[PDB]
Amino acid sequence: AAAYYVGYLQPRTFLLKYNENGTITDAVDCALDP
Amino acid sequence: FNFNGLTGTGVLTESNKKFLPFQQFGRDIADTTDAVRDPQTLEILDITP
Numbered sequence A: 001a002a003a004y005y006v007g008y009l010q011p012r013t014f015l016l017k018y019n020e021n022g023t024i025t026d027a028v029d030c031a032l033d034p
Numbered sequence B: 001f002n003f004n005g006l007t008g009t010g011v012l013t014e015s016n017k018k019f020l021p022f023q024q025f026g027r028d029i030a031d032t033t034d035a036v037r038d039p040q041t042l043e044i045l046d047i048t049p
């Protein structure tokens, strides 16, 4: 009938980007790749 | 000025920014306050040195 998902969080560093209105529209996960 | 306990000096001017309901202050790349919401008129002001 329905479905749901479950994922855990870890302490990491992220680089966010705010657009002209102040909304977050992109991000980068430092130390996820080289 | 003294906006909800925050003191400083500058020139206040009307702004065109739209704060979300849970936000009160705005900062720049230098970590300094440039915008504020008046706690009575609920309008947004710009701070300039």
Ligand SMILES: *[C@@H]1O[C@H](CO)[C@@H](O)[C@H](O)[C@H]1NC(C)=O
Binding pocket: A020, A021
């Ligand atoms: C974001 O700001 C621009 C101008 O800076 C405006 O044209 C646009 O409508 C704004 N976005 C929203 C969702 O209001």
